[PDB]
Amino acid sequence: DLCFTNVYADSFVIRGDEVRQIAPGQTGKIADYNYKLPDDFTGCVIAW
Amino acid sequence: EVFNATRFASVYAWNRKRISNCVADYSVLYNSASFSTFKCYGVSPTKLN
Numbered sequence A: 001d002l003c004f005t006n007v008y009a010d011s012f013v014i015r016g017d018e019v020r021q022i023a024p025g026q027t028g029k030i031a032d033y034n035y036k037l038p039d040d041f042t043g044c045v046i047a048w
Numbered sequence B: 001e002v003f004n005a006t007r008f009a010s011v012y013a014w015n016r017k018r019i020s021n022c023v024a025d026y027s028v029l030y031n032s033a034s035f036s037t038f039k040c041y042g043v044s045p046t047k048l049n
């Protein structure tokens, strides 16, 4: 029921036990040196 | 000796250890360890350093 303004799509492959690291505060090998999300994120995370 | 031991206790006789006089640089675990569940309760994990 909405319309979206500035849409971007990221994409990568990791290992299962690291999916929990894709979030605002996670401080791990993936969130520290590889990929980090803001603390005021607006969007959706999707894994499979 | 903790995460890389040889035998762990039985949950009915769980073990308990004491840690003192050491440096907590957990970044040594990134190379070999892989945790599926990690949750801190009374502290934010971005301030464990």
Ligand SMILES: CCCCC/C=C\C/C=C\CCCCCCCC(=O)O
Residues within 6 Å of the ligand: A027, A028, A029, B002, B019, B024, B026, B029, B030, B033, B034, B035, B038, B048
């Ligand atoms: C030997 C125990 C020393 C205890 C020191 C006190 C607090 C330290 C808190 C957490 C240390 C382990 C965090 C797990 C490492 C991040 C997850 C990962 O590996 O990616």
